Amino acid sequence: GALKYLEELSKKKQSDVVRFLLRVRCWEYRQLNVIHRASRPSRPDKARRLGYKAKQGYVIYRVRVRRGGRKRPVPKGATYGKPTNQGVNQLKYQRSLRATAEERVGRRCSNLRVLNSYWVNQDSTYKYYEVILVDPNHKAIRRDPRINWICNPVHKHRECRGLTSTGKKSRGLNKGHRFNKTRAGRRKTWKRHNTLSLWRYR
Amino acid sequence: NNHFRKHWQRRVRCHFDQPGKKVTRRLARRAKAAALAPRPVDKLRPIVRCPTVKYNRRTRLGRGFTLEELKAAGIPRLLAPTIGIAVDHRRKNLSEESLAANVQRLKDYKARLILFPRKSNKPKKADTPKDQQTAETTTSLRTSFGVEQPLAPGFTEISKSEIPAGIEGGAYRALRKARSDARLVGVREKRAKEKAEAEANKK
Amino acid sequence: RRLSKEDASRVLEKTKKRLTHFPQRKYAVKA
Amino acid sequence: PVERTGLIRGLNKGHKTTRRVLKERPSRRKGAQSKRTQFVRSLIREVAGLAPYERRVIELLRNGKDKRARKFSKKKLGTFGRAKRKCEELQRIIAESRRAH
Amino acid sequence: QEKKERLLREATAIKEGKKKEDVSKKPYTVKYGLNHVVGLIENKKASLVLIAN
Amino acid sequence: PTRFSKTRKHRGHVVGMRHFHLLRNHYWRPSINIDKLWSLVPSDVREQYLSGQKKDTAPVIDLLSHGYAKLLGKGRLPEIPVVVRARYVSAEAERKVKEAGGVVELVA
RNA sequence: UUGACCUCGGAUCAGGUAGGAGGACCCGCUGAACUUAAGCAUAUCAAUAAGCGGAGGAAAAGAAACCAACAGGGAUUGCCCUAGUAACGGCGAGUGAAGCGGCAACAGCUCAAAUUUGAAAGCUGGCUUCGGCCCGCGUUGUAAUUUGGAGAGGAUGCUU
RNA sequence: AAAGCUCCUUCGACGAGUCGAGUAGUUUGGGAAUGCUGCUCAAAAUGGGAGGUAAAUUUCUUCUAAAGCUAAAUACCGGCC
């Protein structure tokens, strides 16, 4: 069908047609609100492969977040401790702007569950994302075995706990020797390695 | 070398619940056995050889049987987990010996298997008849189908006429020669190709 | 707020076919 | 497969077994070209065109400055192998454009 | 509604025992749907394609 | 116990290279000398061999089954032919086995 | 003129949902200093305390873009061992894993990328005489089929 | 009506501001081999990732990322018994 062509076209982000579309849509999204509902996904192939369905109970919300680093909220931008040899301009937030976008969209629609999200645009000030959300109280959602896992209470606010794709990436949940400290949870692994274990017959 | 410079007393784990946890595990094992009876409490596992050069002398139980093993033993991959056989799609059979041993293991299991019909009134041709459903049964496949011979036999007797001649030149010299040839693989190849190029130039 | 029993026990058609033609069997192993 | 020597060191070391020839696993087919994806990628290349860095490299290749094109492609893409593959692809599109013209 | 009527009339004929080949005929309709139309174009089964503005 | 301590009495009176990602299983190769080689034979059969009730047979010892990879050459052997299968062997151990009338076979 | 789409709105419209508490344990974010290094900006304390967000009866992780280099193992988790080891470290105080191996427990799967095209076969809601009938969603794709262990197309004859 | 097995000429779609690279901060035993985040550049089709010393050439071995679900063994200074 057409979505293979859309995926190959969305690969080519520096072609004339794609840059023109990105520019005009970025101006439009800048004129719109910071968080606003998208009636349909502007990247239907990306939304479909991330799990969006044209079924009642699926919504798309478009959100823009300020890009760059993170600034520590100390008075006059200076701390009164030991020297750090670096300023607040070079501090890095450990989660992604995609995660920030998902969390703000979830707070805006607290009755829904964040399924996934995807990049749609960026400029010098903002990054633009579209978040797919699913209504766990809708009958079409609750009757579908491919999605009714999300109705269970253990999936309340997955984006706040890092259970989305960008959250798994940021927590470093991958197999191998490069992810020794983080594959099972960093703090859990640290507690296990710093726990002193004393048996009865030692 | 004492690592007590953190707040170690916040995360001291004692184990005064060791007998209680053993009792809990035994109760769970009894409940699982009662729920699964008359089936065995565990699945059938294959015989695999441990990796690395330290542990390749010894065999142990693996995760599950391969698809090639199931195909050679005549058990479909969808029926196999439903009759107490573990299936592992990641493992491959690179050699004939492990494949043959696991196929023999599966054939022995299928010979000793009793299969009750889904409906009592209508038994099928693949099902065990009522006059053969009565036999003494086992409940531990890890015991009845365990690793019988984990290591090679360390002692064997042969006649004095069958003593091998041995490697010519000596075993120590054979090891030294093998090491030297391995270290001089590439140098001899470079010399050979240089000689071939010189012969081609001045033939 | 918990899912109803019918919706929780509802299953896909491919899984239904698999459970129809290959269910968990009652079996025993001779000693 | 090559038979092992039965020794602990040297070339072809290791315990002797009868090696099997496996049917090739479907998970290892990745990277192979398919007719549909080839057709779709060719059509999308025709529809979209080229990137500005690709235009710079193809113009350097038209002038024949191959080493500078390889260096610029490595700077743009990051790795030497990806730069070499991109330069070969741009050579092929120059060749088809010339055989068309 | 027309489809439901066709199904009911065909069900009457099957209730009588007549064949679906006897009671029905090959349909001829405009083909729509994006993936379907793209597939038809690739398989060269499409005679004419109208694309929305 | 607290009652035995001295405090109760004192109550009232107070180089080279660095190897990244080392795997010890690469370098696993335990060694056994030849003076302990006959201890690997089971006791009764060893007594029969040393007394001389088996003059037409030779024992075959697989060191890898007992957990040894190299046969070293400390000590002396009796004049009995023994087949020894090992991954590694030292020159003196092989020479002493050959004087005893056996053979050292190389395995992997 | 009349109507249709698209986008954006209103309603004490019909039906739902969230907030707060708790927070021992769990998932993240943010984040010290006393202390120890003669003092001290690397370091240590500590990727800890305090601060913020989010769950459950467990959570999390989880069915390899793994480990390996072997005669190869085979999702995750935890215990024992690996091991105070490989490694990191001003002017050195110190820090410190992993594969294999034994055990406890084991369970596997769902989508996107294909045209049902000889028939959207799918679904929310409203009213019911409970048989169904309507208003809609949806072709910018809802069902069936397929997920790499494969599968699709054929051929084949038995089984469920 | 669905479903499994066997064989096969052929076909066999497989996730992009993502992978990867540079740089900065932080983190790690991985201050030559770690992860995460921000900024800049930005992929491919037997291709890609990894193979704990930087690079080129030729091989080899393993997997198949950028979508998702899932009990048990594990924890528990809160609550109830």
TrEMBL record, chain A:
Basic residues bias spans: 168-185
Residues that hold Mg(2+) 2 according to the record: 84
Stretches for region Disordered: 164-185
Residues noted as binding Mg(2+) 1 in the record, renumbered to the chain: 80
GO biological process: cytoplasmic translation
GO MF annotations, alphabetized: RNA binding; structural constituent of ribosome
Record keyword DNA repair present: no
Alphabetically ordered keywords of this record: Metal-binding, Ribonucleoprotein, Ribosomal protein
SUPFAM superfamilies hit by this protein: Ribosomal proteins S24e, L23 and L15e
GO CC annotation: cytosolic large ribosomal subunit
Keyword Metal-binding: yes
Family: Belongs to the eukaryotic ribosomal protein eL15 family.
NCBIfam families (UniProt xref): PRK04243.1
Protein name: Ribosomal protein L15
Species classification: Eukaryota, Fungi, Dikarya, Ascomycota, Pezizomycotina
Automatic annotation (TrEMBL), chain B:
GO cellular component: cytosolic large ribosomal subunit
Annotated InterPro entries: Ribosomal_eL13, Ribosomal_eL13_CS
Residue span of region Disordered: 117-159, 183-203
Protein name per the record: 60S ribosomal protein L13
HAMAP family in UniProt: Ribosomal_eL13
Any one GO MF annotation of this record: structural constituent of ribosome
Family affiliation: Belongs to the eukaryotic ribosomal protein eL13 family.
GO biological process: translation
Lineage: Eukaryota, Fungi, Dikarya, Ascomycota, Pezizomycotina
Assigned keywords, A-Z: Ribonucleoprotein, Ribosomal protein
Biased composition (Polar residues): 131-143
From TrEMBL, chain D:
Stored InterPro entries: Ribosomal_eL36 (IPR000509), Ribosomal_eL36_sf (IPR038097)
Molecular function GO terms recorded: structural constituent of ribosome
Pfam families, alphabetized: Ribosomal_L36e (PF01158)
An annotated GO BP: translation
PROSITE patterns in UniProt: RIBOSOMAL_L36E (PS01190)
PANTHER family per UniProt: 60S RIBOSOMAL PROTEIN L36
Protein's UniProt name: 60S ribosomal protein L36
Source species taxonomy: Eukaryota, Fungi, Dikarya, Ascomycota, Pezizomycotina
TrEMBL record, chain E:
Ribosomal protein among keywords: yes
GO molecular function annotations of the record: RNA binding
A cellular-component GO term for this protein: cytosolic large ribosomal subunit
UniProt entry tagged with the keyword Ribosomal protein: yes
Keywords for the protein's UniProt record, in alphabetical order: Ribonucleoprotein, Ribosomal protein
Domain of life: Eukaryota
GO aspect biological process, one term: ribosome biogenesis
Family per record: Belongs to the eukaryotic ribosomal protein eL8 family.
Function: Component of the ribosome.
Protein name: 60S ribosomal protein L8
